[PDB]
Amino acid sequence: ASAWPEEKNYHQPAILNSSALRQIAEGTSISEMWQNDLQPLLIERYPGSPGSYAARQHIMQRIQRLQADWVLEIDTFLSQTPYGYRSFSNIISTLNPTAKRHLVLACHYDSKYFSHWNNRVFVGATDSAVPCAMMLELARALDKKLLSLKPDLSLQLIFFDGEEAFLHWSPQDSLYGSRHLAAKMASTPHPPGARGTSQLHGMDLLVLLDLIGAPNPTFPNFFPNSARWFERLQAIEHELHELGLLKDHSLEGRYFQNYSYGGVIQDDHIPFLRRGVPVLHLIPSPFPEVWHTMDDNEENLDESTIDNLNKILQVFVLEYLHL
Ligand SMILES: [Zn+2]
């Protein structure tokens, strides 16, 4: 009876030296992400809307043009909602589908529904168009390294639909895509042919990005079973900082501080966490001041902070995958 699902407990990163860190810092382009990955998502895209379709096509197209062997799946399903039955579509992008273990990066691509107000439309820039764009830029920037995966461990990206409540949060009105996908993965044998292990056992760690893009974010270390990985983000941030590879950044104003948060934050990680999946929740506390406001737009995003976080996340992923 293989103990492979326990490998994630002992998994260690292969740390990048200074030369490699400089390479990663130089290999990501915040202006290219801004134009090519982010702006096309700064549109109204609540579930079922034309914008949802447009956002999904954009995410799929940006991944499809890459050299690495990404396998795209659209996970479409029905759920009851305050507005009756509706359809939702999660986007899953996977390298090495049969690999037993995957490091998983995720965010939600839907935008919260709001009737237009005084000619303003809610586009959820930090929530979560930026996280979507960061995942797309990571796939682009690391494409040559990821192509080499073509340690039975690889990478998966999930863009959840329906994270937002159609009204205000309630247990039944929110997390449509993640409640559905967590249940589906929990009941899907993995690897193919397995007798008693599921796709959830294969999830080494779920790194969920949400509400990223405002100035001065502070991310708390939420969970003890992923605290050692939170510490790696702190170390990566510290070293990139010391090497002069971050912009408009100080250690007093660092993003990953030494502090926990014992309360529960409702987000897409919940259905996974409650089924035993380790989660590294990259959501700031407090939330951006523009949270769920028409001001959560492009103008209020902090470019250098997003650039810095792209560098930190890309190093984290390469170190985890030993690339
Ligand atoms: Zn939101």
User: CB burial class (10 A; 0-12, 13-18, 19+) of residue 11?
Assistant: middle
CB 109 within 8 A of CB 45: yes
Residue 273 has φ and ψ, to the nearest 5°, of: -55, -40
Tokens representing 240?
A: 């990139």
Q: For ligand 1, a single-atom ion, which residues have Cβ within 5 Å? A: 127
Residue 175 half-sphere exposure, CB side, CA atoms within 13 Å?
Answer: 18
Ligand 1 centroid to Cα of residue 235, in Å, is 29
Q: Tell me how far apart the alpha carbons of residues 253 and 136 are, in angstroms, rounded to a whole number.
A: 27
Q: For the chain, give every domain's residue range.
A: 1-323
Q: Tell me how far apart the alpha carbons of residues 140 and 150 are, in angstroms, rounded to a whole number.
A: 16
For residues 107-136, one letter each, b for 16 or more C-beta atoms within 10 angstroms of the residue's C-beta and e for the rest, the string is bbbbbbbbeeeeeeebbbbbbbbbbbbbbb
Residue 198 has φ and ψ, to the nearest 5°, of: -115, 175
Beta bridge partners, 104, equal 156, 206
Ligand 1 centroid to Cα of residue 52, in Å, is 15
Tokens representing 61?
A: 């197209």
Q: List, in order, residues 6 or more apart from 12 with CB less than 8 Å away.
A: none
CB 76 within 8 A of CB 128: no
Tokens 């999830």, residue? 203
Ligand 1 centroid to Cα of residue 211, in Å, is 7
Q: List, in order, residues 6 or more apart from 126 with CB less than 8 Å away.
A: 211, 212, 213, 214, 288, 290, 291, 296, 300, 301
Beta bridge partners, 79, equal 86
What superfamily in CATH does domain 1-323 come from?
Zn peptidases (3.40.630.10)
Catalytic residues, by residue number, are: 163, 210
Q: Is 298 annotated as a binding residue?
A: no
Residue 164 DSSP label: S
CB 255 within 8 A of CB 166: no
Residue 280 amino acid letter: L
Q: Tell me how far apart the alpha carbons of residues 6 and 147 are, in angstroms, rounded to a whole number.
A: 26
3-state secondary structure of 273: helix
Strand order in the sheet with 101-108: 71-79, 86-94, 153-160, 101-108, 203-209, 279-282
Q: Is 231 annotated as a binding residue?
A: no
Q: Tell me how far apart the alpha carbons of residues 156 and 290 are, in angstroms, rounded to a whole number.
A: 30
Ligand 1 centroid to Cα of residue 96, in Å, is 31
Residue 117 DSSP label: B
Q: Is 238 annotated as a binding residue?
A: no
Experimental resolution (Å): 1.7
3-state secondary structure of 300: helix
Q: Tell me how far apart the alpha carbons of residues 323 and 163 are, in angstroms, rounded to a whole number.
A: 31
CB 111 within 8 A of CB 45: yes
3-state secondary structure of 46: coil
Q: Tell me how far apart the alpha carbons of residues 285 and 308 are, in angstroms, rounded to a whole number.
A: 18
The secondary structure of 83-104 as a DSSP string is TSSEEEEEEEEESSTTSSEEEE
Q: List, in order, residues 6 or more apart from 228 with CB less than 8 Å away.
A: none
- CA dihedral for 151, 313, 251, 217, sign (positive or negative): negative
Residue 229 half-sphere exposure, CB side, CA atoms within 13 Å?
Answer: 29
CB 101 within 8 A of CB 37: no
Ligand 1 centroid to Cα of residue 169, in Å, is 10
CB 302 within 8 A of CB 126: no
